[PDB]
């Protein structure tokens, strides 16, 4: 006789204010980039990423994130 | 007897509030990107990237996320 | 006798609030992008991507996301 | 006797408000992209992109997700 | 003797609000692809592209994306 | 007679307020990256970034983040 | 009593010979042009060029050019 | 009495021998320009170019050039 | 009683000479240019260039130049 | 009684030889450029160039130059 | 009773030799510039240059130069 | 009685050998470059240069240089 009882309570709050998000500059000025290779062998669950050159602007009013895992093995 | 109970209860926020998005400026100045190789083998679950010169601009007006995950294994 | 009871509740809100998305401007440059390969073999779940010069402007009013998974695996 | 009770509950809400989306301007300059290769074999799920030069103006008002999946395996 | 219930319960809601959609400028400026290959052999699912010199404009007022999996394996 | 009981409570709060986020300037100045390698042979779980030259500006009003993890094994 | 006398003498020789005058690839790849003005006013001698997006290729065999200006004066 | 010779002699060479002109390749990759302005006054002897995007290719077997001026002013 | 002799003689070579002009490659990738102003006056000898993106490939066999000016002022 | 004798004597050679002009190859990578002003005015012998993005290839076998200036005031 | 003669005797050489221009590589890897003023006012004999992102690859077999002036002020 | 002989000789040679003018590279990686200013006066002879990102690559053959001046001042 075995019993399990699994009862999570999250009421929780992740909020965020703001009264303006304002000007904002970007600006890169070039590069090199060089990668020289002769054998690739990736299996399974890999990720790569070879030789980039990127730029990112990224302005998210909020962007609040929230993970939760829950998990029960037997 | 085996017995299980899974109640997960969740009330949670995850909100934002932004009065204003203003100006936002990306201006990349270029660049070189060079990569050399002889031999590819990807297999299973492959994520991969060679050679990018990529620009981003992201500017989601609240953008919030929420991952959960729920596992129950016999 | 096995018995399994399972009962998520979610009643959870991502929600955002923007008053105005304003003036956004993305000017990228240009730029060069090279890659020498001889041989490629791909198989089972593969994303690739070989050679790009990409330019992305995402403006979501708005943009939230949630992500739910359930598993029970017997 | 082996019983299974799967009773998921879900009042979610993924909402967004936006006064305005206003001038977003995307201007890209141009660019080079070469790509040499001699063989290629592609086989089961492979999702492949070699050489591109894309541009993308993606404002969704909204834009809001939500991606749910629920399994059972006996 | 073996039983399974199977009753989701899905009240949920992705909307969107957005007062206005307003100027939205897209000017792409050209450039330059070249991919060189000698054989290609595309075998099951594949879904490929090469030597693309893409532009798009994606403005959806909502643009909401609901999606949902069910599966029950015995 | 094995019985569990697993209750947790959470009524926690992650907030923010900013009265204004102003002006920010990001400003690179190119650069040179050179990598040479000859094999290249990854299993498993493998993250790999190889001979990059990336600019990120993040800006978001908010970025709260609240990361919760319950696993119960027997 | 003033006396000229005016008595150049040319016995110069310009020219060129190629054997063979082989394959020119001229292959542009677009572009953009704005130009924006209220008020134009050119006057006496004015030559002027706004907002072109021109391709030449000249290829002359020979192409040798002599530019002689002769002036007296009283 | 005021007596004035002028005898130029001139017996020059602007030769050119080349054996064979080969492949010339000019792949121009796009690009952005952008001019704003007013108001324009453009008098006397005025050479003007003004928001251009302009592509030359230009391969004269010989090319040679001979500029010659004379004056003389009493 | 004033007496001028002007007697210059020239029996200059400028000349070349080339086995063989091979390949040449001109790849330019591109680019951002924007200029703004409110007034332009120009007077008497002016040259003037303002917002150019402009790409050259001058490959002439031979392209020897002789320039020679006589002037005699009185 | 003012005597003047001028007698210049040129037999000088300005000369080349090349074997073989052979790969060059010129890959510019883009840029941005970005210039504002209010008045300009230019008078008399103005050479100006405002704002300019260019990529020159300049390969002339021979190339020699030869500039000679005579000049008698009285 | 003035006289004056005058007598150059030039037979001067200048000459090169080379066996083989061989394999040249220009890769520039972009850049940023940012030029602000308010007037400008150019006058006489004025060469001027604001605001450039210039690529230049120069190779004349030969380029020999010879540069000479003669003046005789009375 | 005032006599005066101009008697210049000139055999000099400039002379030059050179094998082979083997491989070169150039790679620059970008940069910045700003420039403020509110007032620009330039008169008589000027030559200027403001806010300059600038990439040489010059590779002559020979490459020699001779200058002569003369000058006879009464």
Same mark, same amino acid.
């Given at each position: ?5 699994? #009862? ?5 709050? =992740?909020? &965020? +204010?703001? @009264?303006? *998000?304002? /000007? %904002?500059?970007?600006? $890169?000025? !070039? ?7 002769? #054998? ?5 669950? =890999?990720? &790569? +990423?070879? @030789?980039? *050159?990127? /730029? %990112?602007?990224?302005? $998210?009013? !909020? ?7 829950? #998990?029960?093995?037997?």
């Amino acid at each position: 006789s075995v019993q399990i009882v699994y #009862k999570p309570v999250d009421l929780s709050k =992740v909020t &965020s +204010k703001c @009264g303006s *998000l304002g /000007n %904002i500059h970007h600006k $890169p000025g !070039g590069g090199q980039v060089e990668v020289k290779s002769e #054998k690739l062998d990736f299996k399974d669950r =890999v990720q &790569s +990423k070879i @030789g980039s *050159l990127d /730029n %990112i602007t990224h302005v $998210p009013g !909020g962007g609040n994130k929230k993970i939760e895992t829950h #998990k029960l093995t037997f």
